Design a protein around this ligand. Sequence first.
Ligand SMILES: C=C(C)[C@@H]1CCC(C)=C[C@H]1c1c(C)cc(O)cc1O
Length: 139
Amino acid sequence: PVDFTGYWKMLVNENFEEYLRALDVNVALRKIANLLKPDKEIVQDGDHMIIRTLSTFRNYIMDFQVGKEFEEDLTGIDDRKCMTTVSWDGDKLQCVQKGEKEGRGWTQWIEGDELHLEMRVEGVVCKQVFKKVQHHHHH
Ligand SMILES: C=C(C)[C@@H]1CCC(C)=C[C@H]1c1c(C)cc(O)cc1O
């Protein structure tokens, strides 16, 4: 039984600028965005999952029910919205973001004290890893 609940600090973020370039994000914002090291605050409450991606530059909040398609507003990231479904795939969480772009989604799992997050679009792959932390900040 995987439970993603916790607070997590970014350790690595690989190939994020190419991921954003594939989303047609402009180069100035790609640089700004790749300097950011957001935290993740996750509360898993039955099939109700809240994933808060937190930084001083911006927060992006996901709040959904596993297995239920919903409209995800990503216009602050790439000026697009998607019809998104998050599903359990073994011990992994699989997200498919249907919309203008082909093959858009991500995959999340836990290894030890690491939260692993692979995000993808148009065959471009960005891999992030976060470490579980215990010192909390208000937000
Ligand atoms: C909402 C935030 C913090 C920013 C907002 C601007 C862009 C273009 C991406 C977002 C982002 C996300 C979603 C995740 C991430 O690891 C790094 C980022 O920069």
